[PDB]
Amino acid sequence: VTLQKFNGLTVLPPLLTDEMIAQYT
Amino acid sequence: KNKCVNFNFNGLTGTGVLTESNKKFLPFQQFGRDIADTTDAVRDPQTLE
Numbered sequence A: 001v002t003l004q005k006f007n008g009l010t011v012l013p014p015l016l017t018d019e020m021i022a023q024y025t
Numbered sequence B: 001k002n003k004c005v006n007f008n009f010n011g012l013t014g015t016g017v018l019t020e021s022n023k024k025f026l027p028f029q030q031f032g033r034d035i036a037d038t039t040d041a042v043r044d045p046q047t048l049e
């Protein structure tokens, strides 16, 4: 799986990080 | 440069930080646009930078 600030759009991070989700899984 | 300012370039107005670009334009081009059709680079009229 593969993947603007000038216009007031903000894409803030999730609460759980990917290294934390990795620990739950 | 390295401060944000109410800028204008040949009537291309905006507000933002100005800093030097690794991008090269062709000789006739004056400003650059991103994929969202929005301006993200401009040439200085007197220093062609």
Ligand SMILES: *[C@@H]1O[C@H](CO)[C@@H](O[C@@H]2O[C@H](CO)[C@@H](O)[C@H](O)[C@H]2NC(C)=O)[C@H](O)[C@H]1NC(C)=O
Pocket (backbone or CB within 6 Å): B045, B046
């Ligand atoms: C506009 O005028 C400036 C001078 O104020 C020109 O810039 C000069 O360019 C020459 C040749 O490249 C340099 O030797 C000088 O050092 C430059 N002077 C300064 C202070 O920048 C500029 O070329 C002119 N623009 C046009 C389109 O003629």
